[PDB]
């Protein structure tokens, strides 16, 4: 990750377990019998001015879309993962600090929120510096944290859901930047000692349970703690040597074929 375990909050990717059909109904935008946002563009529409805007809107989604396909292609199905800096919260409370309800439409501009990020994701650096190519380890040492910030701050999102204004948004992207760099671990430090200790406590919590009471059982048998030593000892004789093999199907998805 690059971050200090201790400053982190499991988070959720709205943009994942979503049907493509509803995905489009959250981020994508067009002039095709739509133009519903103009009802929010208040105050000030343009309107539509000259190109540019129409173009930013499909370019945002080119990348918000290269993120929907990958993941997956990497993550099984789960969605809850632990990231640094609770974003889902910096926005509430944030709609407490400034409030403003649907009645007040956004004093923002689609050409700002998109610059907003690009300027304040590139402020989230943890590997310094450039030193060309050394900017690569960094571009994707925060790549995950990144797809969040294009999913909870992509355009249609900030005007349909939770209308923001220059001041609010400017302050949101404030805390993020700050809470991020305040979450970068070390140097120091001792990441093994502390980590090792935490790994020991967990085992102790299992050992007992894996035995507690507790039967009595069959198949899949293996046990916990009592096994640990087996793994660390890489010993050949590991009681339950088990091994799980999957299939296709076919074969199979049936049964009698299996």
Partner 1 sequence: SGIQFSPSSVPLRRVEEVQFGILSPEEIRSMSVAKIEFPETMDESGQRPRVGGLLDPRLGTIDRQFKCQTCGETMADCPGHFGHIELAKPVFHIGFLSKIKKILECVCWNCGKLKIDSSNPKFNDTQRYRDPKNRLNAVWNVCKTKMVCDTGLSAGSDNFDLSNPSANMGHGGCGAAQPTIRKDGLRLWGSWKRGKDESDLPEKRLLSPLEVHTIFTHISSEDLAHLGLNEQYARPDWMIITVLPVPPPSVRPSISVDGTSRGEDDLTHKLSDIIKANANVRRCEQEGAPAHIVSEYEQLLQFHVATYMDNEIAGQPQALQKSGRPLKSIRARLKGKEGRLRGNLMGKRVDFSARTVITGDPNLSLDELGVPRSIAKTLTYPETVTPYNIYQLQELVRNGPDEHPGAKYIIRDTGERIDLRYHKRAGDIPLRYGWRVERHIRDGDVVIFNRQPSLHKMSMMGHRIRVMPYSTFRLNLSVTSPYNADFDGDEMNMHVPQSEETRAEIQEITMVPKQIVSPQSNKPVMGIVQDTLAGVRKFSLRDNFLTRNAVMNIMLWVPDWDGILPPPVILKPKVLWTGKQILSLIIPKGINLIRDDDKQSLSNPTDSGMLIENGEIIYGVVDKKTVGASQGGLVHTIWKEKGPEICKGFFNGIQRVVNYWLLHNGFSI
Partner 2 sequence: SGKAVAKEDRTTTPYMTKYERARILGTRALQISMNAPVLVDLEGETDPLQIAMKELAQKKIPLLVRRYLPDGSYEDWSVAELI
Partner 3 sequence: ILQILGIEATRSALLKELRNVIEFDGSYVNYRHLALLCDVMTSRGHLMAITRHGINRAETGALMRCSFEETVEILMDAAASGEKDDCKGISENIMLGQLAPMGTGAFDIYLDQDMLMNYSLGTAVPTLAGSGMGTSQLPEGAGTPYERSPMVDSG
The answer to whether 194 touches 175, Cβ cutoff 8 Å, is no
Look up residue 91 and give its two tokens.
Answer: 């926005």
State yes or no: residue 82 binds partner 3 (CB under 8 A).
Answer: yes
- Contact residues for 185 (Cβ-Cβ < 8 A; gap 6+): 2, 3, 4, 5, 191
Q: Looking at beta carbons only, is 179 or 227 nearer to partner 3?
A: 227
Which partner in partner 3, partner 1, partner 2, none is near 92 (CB below 5 to 8 A by kind)?
Answer: partner 1
Closest to 26 in 3D by CA, of 17, 225, 139: 17
CA distance 91 to 18: 22
CB of 192 to partner 3, least distance (A): 6
Subset of residues 185 to 244 that bind partner 3, contact rule: CB under 8 A: 186-192, 194-196, 198-199, 201-203, 205-206, 209, 224-225, 227-228, 231-234
Binding mask 188-227 toward partner 2 (x if CB under 8 A, else -) reads: xx--------------------------------------
State yes or no: residue 129 binds partner 2 (CB under 8 A).
Answer: yes
State yes or no: residue 77 binds partner 2 (CB under 8 A).
Answer: no
What's 188's DSSP letter? S
State yes or no: residue 1 binds partner 3 (CB under 8 A).
Answer: yes
CA distance 64 to 148: 10
Q: Looking at beta carbons only, is 56 or 230 nearer to partner 3?
A: 230
Reduced to 3 states, what is the DSSP secondary structure of residue 184?
Answer: strand
CA distance 65 to 59: 10
- Contact residues for 12 (Cβ-Cβ < 8 A; gap 6+): 79, 80, 81, 88
Binding site for partner 3 (CB under 8 A): 1, 5, 82, 186-192, 194-196, 198-199, 201-203, 205-206, 209, 224-225, 227-228, 231-234
Where on the chain is the footprint of partner 2 (CB under 8 A)? 128-129, 131, 181, 184, 186-189
């Amino acid at each position: 990750d690059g971050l200090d375990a201790t400053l982190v909050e499991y988070q959720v990717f709205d943009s994942l377990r979503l049907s493509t059909k509803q995905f489009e109904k959250k981020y994508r935008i067009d002039l095709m019998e739509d133009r519903s946002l103009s009802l929010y563009m208040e105050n000030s529409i343009e309107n539509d001015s000259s190109v540019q805007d129409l173009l930013d809107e499909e370019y945002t989604q080119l990348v918000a879309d290269r993120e929907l396909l990958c993941k997956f292609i990497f993550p099984k199905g789960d969605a809850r993962w632990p990231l640094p800096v609770n974003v889902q919260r910096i926005i509430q409370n944030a709609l407490q600090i400034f409030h403003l309800e649907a009645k007040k439409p956004t004093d923002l501009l689609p050409s700002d929120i998109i610059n907003g990020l690009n300027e304040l994701i590139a402020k989230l650096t943890i590997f310094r510096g450039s030193d060309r190519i050394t900017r690569d380890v960094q571009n994707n040492a925060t790549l995950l944290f990144q797809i969040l910030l294009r999913s909870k701050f992509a355009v249609k999102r900030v005007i349909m859901e939770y209308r923001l204004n220059k001041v609010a948004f400017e302050w949101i992207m404030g805390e993020v930047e700050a809470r991020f760099q305040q979450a970068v671990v070390s140097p120091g430090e001792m990441v093994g000692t502390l980590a090792a200790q935490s790994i020991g406590e967990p085992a102790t919590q299992m050992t007992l349970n894996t035995f507690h009471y507790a039967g009595v059982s069959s198949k899949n048998v293996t046990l916990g703690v009592p096994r640990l030593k087996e793994i660390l000892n890489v010993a050949k004789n590991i009681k339950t040597p088990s091994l799980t093999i999957y299939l296709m199907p076919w074969i199979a998805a049936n049964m009698d074929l299996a």
